[PDB]
Every structure is written in structure tokens, then in C-alpha cells.
Amino acid sequence: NPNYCFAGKTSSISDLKEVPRKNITLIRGLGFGEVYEGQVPLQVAVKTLPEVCSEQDELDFLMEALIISKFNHQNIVRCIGVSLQSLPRFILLELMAGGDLKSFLRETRPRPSQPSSLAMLDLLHVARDIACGCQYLEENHFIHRDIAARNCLLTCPGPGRVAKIGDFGMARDIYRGGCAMLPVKWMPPEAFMEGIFTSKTDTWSFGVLLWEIFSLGYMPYPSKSNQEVLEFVTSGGRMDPPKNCPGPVYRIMTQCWQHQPEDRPNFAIILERIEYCTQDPDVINTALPIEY
Ligand SMILES: C[C@H]1Oc2nc(cnc2N)-c2c(nc3ccc(C#N)cn23)CN(C)C(=O)c2ccc(F)cc21
């Protein structure tokens, strides 16, 4: 059985908390492999491994389980346990009732019917939450490689919501595919060119996430294909501010997208800047666009 190392500690499949299959009930589907809402009463999301899979899919599934179980931070989704001794195999995650962040932003956009559905402070709180998770990964020398709204989750739809990093599939793949599947629109120049990844890789991606958040869920680089973005970014091109985006917030984005990784902020600095934005009345009193 494959070993996993995080923060200098080794873990094995033996370390995963096996939950007896009889204690687990599926309730409804949520969305390779399926995801279900479930009960163990503790409410969970259940990732399943198709019984029709390759041995590599099996190892991938096991590794995903090891990776998430070894994290310990409030802004990374918890693993309640696994059910690997019955088929189909389950990974049991903290149930994030708010769903993924991208879908949330698109669905919760202010509208004439829901004029005050979201405010700048809601977005800054989401940004801070994920930056805190990223800081934890950084200080533990784990490179996420795919920081993007689709990979973040919310505890609940409502005001007290907390955002967390919820998917680690890219990092799992790299720990051990094709060009058309790479998250090019979230990657820095040295990443897709030399295949060099460092903590500053995640800083660049966080910048793109920030744009996703303040655009309220738009796809980055509107109207641009992957190759067009690659050439755009490699030549110094950067996204414009999202609609109504406060200058101080856009400025964090543009610092995250510095060409030289040494010139980009670490997450401690990003968190400090997000904090200062949240204090600034001119930032948080800015109205988000109302989509007609
Ligand atoms: C593996 C899956 O984990 C989870 N999904 C939801 C909630 N909690 C999870 N631990 C979750 C998702 N959508 C909804 C809708 C309603 C409710 C409730 N109640 C929960 N969810 C997102 N999703 C389908 C996903 O696969 C998805 C997308 C991104 C990600 F990072 C993780 C996940």
C-alpha cells in the first residue's frame, strides 16, 4: 500500500478512519465518480469510487483520502472518514451545505428580486477564508496547484457562511491527464512554461480566484481560449477589474499576478491586505452590480 507524506509525517491506508458501511446512509445525489449527501447523526458528503475503475483510479482515490485526512485547518474541508472495505468505496467529507463557491456566486448574484443578496463584505470574508487556508498550505509546504472557485465550498448559503478549500485532485495527480485539461487560466507563466511550481504558484492562482469572487462567478479572461490566455499572460497581459471592483481589491489581484514569483506576495501579506480592505469604508460601502 502507498505511503503519503505531509509536513514530514508519513501516513498509510491503515491511518484512515474506517467507518462501518452499515452506519452510512445515502440521502440524495449532489453531482468521475458521484457525490451524495449522506448520514453516519452526522451529516456528510460522500465521494464514491466507481466499481468499474482501473487500479490507478483506485490508487488515486486512496491518495485523495490520505491527503485530505492529514490536513488540520478550519478552512480546509474535514474528512470524517472512509469506507474502503466495501464496494463502491466511499470517502466521507464535511457536508458543506452552501455548495461550491462558483455556483454560489452565480446563483446568489444581486438582482431586482434579491437586491441585497450579497455585499462587498461577504466577498471579502470569502477571500479571507480561502487565503487563510492557502496560508496553512504554504506554511506546510504544500502546493495546491488549482486554487479556483470551483474547488472551494461554503458551509451554508447564509450570512455566517465559511469558505473552505474542498478539492485536491490536481495536487493528488502530481503527487501520483493532458494539455486540454490543465487549469491554464489559473496558472502563472513559469508554471505552464517551465513546469516550475512553488508556493508563489498558488499566489497567482489566488489572484485569479479573487477576480472570480469579485466578478461574482464569471469565467476568467472573458472570450479568451486557453491558448489565447497563455499568450496574453506570457506577454504581460492581465485581466481588467471586475465590474464595480474597489481599487484596493484590484490592487491585490495585480500584485498576485506579478511576472516574477519573487515579486508576488506570500499569503501572510495577502491576508494583511484583505484585512485592510475590509476595514476601509470606501471599499465595503461599494455596491455590487445588480444583474437585471
Ligand atoms: C466532493 C464534493 O464535496 C462536497 N460537496 C458539497 C458539499 N460538501 C462537500 N464536502 C456540495 C456541492 N454542491 C452541493 C449542493 C448542496 C449541498 C448540500 N447540502 C452540498 N453540495 C459541490 N459538489 C457537488 C462537488 O462535487 C464538490 C465540488 C467542489 C469541491 F471542492 C468538493 C465537492
Curated annotation (Swiss-Prot):
Effect noted on mutating A131T: In NBLST3; somatic mutation
Binding residue positions for ATP: K47, E94, L95, M96, D167
UniProt effect for mutating M63R: In NBLST3; somatic mutation
Domain Protein kinase: 24-283
Superkingdom, natural source: Eukaryota
Tissue expr: Expressed in brain and CNS. Also expressed in the small intestine and testis, but not in normal lymphoid cells.
Residues recorded as bearing Phosphotyrosine in the entry: Y4, Y36, Y175
Result of altering F142C: In NBLST3; somatic mutation
Changes after translation: Phosphorylated at tyrosine residues by autocatalysis, which activates kinase activity. In cells not stimulated by a ligand, receptor protein tyrosine phosphatase beta and zeta complex (PTPRB/PTPRZ1) dephosphorylates ALK at the sites in ALK that are undergoing autophosphorylation through autoactivation. N-glycosylated.
Mutagenesis / variant outcome for changing Y175S: In NBLST3; somatic mutation
Record remark: domains: The EGF-like region drives the cytokine specificity for ALKAL2. The heparin-binding region binds heparin glycosaminoglycan. Heparin-binding is required for ALKAL2-driven activation.
Subunit comment: Homodimer; homodimerizes following heparin- and ligand-binding. Interacts with CBL, IRS1, PIK3R1 and PLCG1. Interacts with FRS2 and SHC1. Interacts with PTN and MDK.
Associated pathology: A chromosomal aberration involving ALK is found in a form of non-Hodgkin lymphoma. Translocation t(2;5)(p23;q35) with NPM1. The resulting chimeric NPM1-ALK protein homodimerize and the kinase becomes constitutively activated. The constitutively active fusion proteins are responsible for 5-10% of non-Hodgkin lymphomas.
Described function: Neuronal receptor tyrosine kinase that is essentially and transiently expressed in specific regions of the central and peripheral nervous systems and plays an important role in the genesis and differentiation of the nervous system. Also acts as a key thinness protein involved in the resistance to weight gain: in hypothalamic neurons, controls energy expenditure acting as a negative regulator of white adipose tissue lipolysis and sympathetic tone to fine-tune energy homeostasis.
Protein family according to the UniProt entry: Belongs to the protein kinase superfamily. Tyr protein kinase family. Insulin receptor subfamily.
Protein name: ALK tyrosine kinase receptor
Gene that this sequence comes from: ALK
Residues of the full protein shown: 1093 to 1401 of 1620
